């Protein structure tokens, strides 16, 4: 979990929102690496978001 440097359109929008709302953002990256949805991994019927 080394800290990288991320930027782009989304972070610019986040900075604008923080400036307009006094937000102290803490940027994080998805460990799973996917958008995530309801998937069955175990425990039979499990529509849990990932």
């Amino acid at each position: 979990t080394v800290p990288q440097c991320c930027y782009g359109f989304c972070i610019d929008l986040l900075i604008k929102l923080a400036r307009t709302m006094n937000f102290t953002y803490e940027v994080h990256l998805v460990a799973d690496g996917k958008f995530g949805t309801q998937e069955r991994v175990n425990n039979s019927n499990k529509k849990e978001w990932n």
Partner: protein
Amino acid sequence: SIQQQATVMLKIMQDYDWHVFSLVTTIFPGYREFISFVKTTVDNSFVGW
């Protein structure tokens, strides 16, 4: 237990090609948690009744 009975009923409905059902109950102690359990089971199931 009644939850096992509800799961068996859901499996029987699935096997019987019955993907649409209506839950009609009556006011009686203990049935509220059974209704909650069956609702959670049908929501989490991928069958999509």
